[PDB]
Amino acid sequence: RNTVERMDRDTFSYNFYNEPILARRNTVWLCYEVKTKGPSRPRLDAKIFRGQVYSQPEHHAEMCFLSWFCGNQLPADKCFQITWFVSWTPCPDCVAKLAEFLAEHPNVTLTISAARLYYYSERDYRRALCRLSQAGARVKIMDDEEFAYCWENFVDSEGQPFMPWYKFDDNYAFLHRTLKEILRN
Template sequence: MAEKNFSMKRRERKEREAAEMNKDVKELKKEEEKGADGAEASGDGDGAAEQNGDFQVEPMELPPFEIIAGDRINPFTFKFQFKNVEYSSGRNKTFLCYLVDDGNASDGLQRGYLEDEHAGVHAEEAFFTQCMSHYDPALKYTVTWYVSSSPCAACAAKIAEVLTARKNFRLSIFAARLFEWEEAEIQDGLKALHAAGCKLRVMKPLDFSYTWDTFVENEDEALNLWEDCKENYEYYHEKLADILQ
């Protein structure tokens, strides 16, 4: 009986999340169209984005929409991409917010975010090529990621290789959602990350608020968490615990 009630509850949640996703996608398209109209009106969309500190786009000679790097995420984009729903169709990007402490107090923390379109290099791999291009084996790095979804199998394998090779590199990953967690290769990848010393966690409600305050152009507005945020966290937390046990 308990298993039947759980299945019904899960099905009901998926139906509710599907309806919410359709609404979110429509609102996201409106925001993107509004942004596009504003860029056309200004006559220089890229320049306006840089002045506002929203994000910086790769030069046009590179493949478009591969990797976007920046300092602050658009608030509506954050609410859509980081929403910890189980039914996550339509959320086909990875947003990776990062903090890097290299032990040098005078330099302070390195902070920013990466966004990918899964057209080429994923955000996880781009972090090591773009944000860690001046890696120094003499330093001790403490790195924290807040990601919209956990790594795919290929990225998990590459991250595990880096952690195995760089003993001075400590990584913590806080994921809003678990990417295709039911797939065996995804589970193997998460286990490999864990074995390589990566601290894997699912984002709690407080983590969403912290990420909002630290990485989002929020205009000093507090994050109003969505319905079922805590319930969805508990769901993913249980699944990750089962995988890593």
């Protein structure tokens, strides 16, 4: 029900930095929450899981998560709402495989909260991410509330608050503007 291993503060600031560079990288840490529900009936939720997975030499973190989740999952009569905090929006490869997973598991919906964007100026990537955001995933840029939530629940904070780095707000604003253009259709 809780398998969190809290990261260091500096590990958190390293892997969730949000300078909106152009790069093809893949998240190392993937922090996740799993909520139940059922029919579904209005009003959330009841938490059943919170934890993290790590990239492995031949497996991006997103795929290790699908692996773990399908090794767990049982009640096809409940509906699952999954949240991820990741360093980057996923791969084209992972985008494709996530669309596949979502088509195989229609009781599941996924929210991806990313510190910044995977190579945001390739058009096939942008349109692939758009397609995924209507295929049963929500994609969003991590903002101050999600950085605070992450700090509170996945970081060895030891009572310090999260202190934003230089240009935190400009970085976020650009990322959020860009992602809303990508998702606009």
